[PDB]
Amino acid sequence: SPPITYTGRFSLEPAPQSVMQALESLTETQVSDFLSGRSPLTLALRVGDHMMFVQLQLAKPGAVIESFVNHAPGVFSGTFSGTLHPNCQDSSGRPRRDIGTILQILNDLLSATRHYQGM
C-alpha cells in the first residue's frame, strides 16, 4: 500500500468562488481523470482575502514547497509536492473517489504556506 504522491503549481495574489463551489463544479470524469493520474486538475478559487490558481497532478503526509517567488506584497507563486493523507485512501489503497481527497491536498498546500508568508 505505497503512498500516493502529488505535485503542483500555485499562483496567489490579493482579491480586488471558494473551494466548495469550485470542488462541487467538478464533473465525475473530471474527477476520475485526476484521481487516476490521467489528467492534471487546475482550479481558480478565492480563499480568505486572496485569489488562487492551482494546478494539481497525481503520481510524512502533507505538502512541501519546492520553489517560490515573492513578486510583490501578497503576490506569490511557486511549486510543490506532497503525499496524501491515508484516510483519503479507500480499502484498496487508492484515492477515495470523492471531493474530500482534493480538499485534503488543498489543505496540505495551505498548511505548507504557513512557513512562508501570506495569511
Question: What gap in Å lies between CA 8 and CA 99, rounded to an integer?
Answer: 17
In this structure, what are the phi and psi dihedrals at residue 89, rounded to the nearest 5 degrees?
-115, 135
The alpha carbons of the chain give a radius of gyration, in whole angstroms, of 14
Residues 80-97 as b or e (16 or more Cβ within 10 Å = b): bebbbbeebbeeeeebbe
Give me the residues paired with residue 78 across strands.
Answer: 10, 68
Question: What gap in Å lies between CA 13 and CA 51, rounded to an integer?
Answer: 5
Single-letter code of the amino acid located at 21: Q
Does residue 75 lie within any of the structural domains?
Answer: yes
Sign of CA dihedral 23, 27, 31, 37: negative
Containing structural domain, residue 50:
5-113
Residues 109/9, Cβ–Cβ less than 8 Å: no
Does residue 23 lie within any of the structural domains?
Answer: yes
Does residue 106 lie within any of the structural domains?
Answer: yes
Give me the residues paired with residue 80 across strands.
Answer: 8, 65
Does residue 57 lie within any of the structural domains?
Answer: yes
